[PDB]
Design a protein around this ligand. Structure first.
Ligand SMILES: [Cl-]
Ligand SMILES: [Cl-]
Ligand code: NA
Length: 129
């Protein structure tokens, strides 16, 4: 599924992400735009052999099992394919564990390089929330 901007804001809010660990909703929408262009089916392979999955591009070396990243952890206890569903619940629940682990949203390179320190409320402007 390719989400709209306000459609995704509303789903993320419903799932408890607005102000989760102090990050306003616009931070989460901005990160999903530059990580996946709002496409739940996005995958990208990294040099170390791991793969990033779904709307927030969650990595198989630490967070999910894809059966081809040797020595990897499955800290969200899910198959990586569950992160590609049109239902974002699994992605959201796993992202809450990542952002809680000490480094906040700096875990998402595109958030660090393209959202951090910008007017991120612009990403939810105009939406009926
Ligand atoms: Cl915001
Ligand atoms: Cl933080
Ligand atoms: Na893994």
């Amino acid at each position: 599924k390719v989400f709209g901007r306000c459609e995704l804001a509303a789903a993320m809010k419903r799932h408890g992400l607005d102000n989760y660990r102090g990050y306003s909703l616009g931070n989460w929408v901005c990160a999903a735009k530059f990580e996946s262009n709002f496409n739940t089916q996005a995958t990208n392979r990294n040099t170390d052999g791991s793969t990033d999955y779904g709307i927030l591009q969650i990595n198989s070396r630490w967070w999910c099992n894809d059966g081809r990243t040797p020595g990897s952890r499955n800290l969200c206890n899910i198959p990586c394919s569950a992160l590609l569903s049109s239902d974002i619940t699994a992605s959201v629940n796993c992202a809450k564990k990542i952002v809680s682990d000490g480094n906040g949203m700096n875990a998402w390179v595109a958030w660090r390089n393209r959202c951090k320190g910008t007017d991120v409320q612009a990403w939810i402007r105009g939406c009926r929330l």
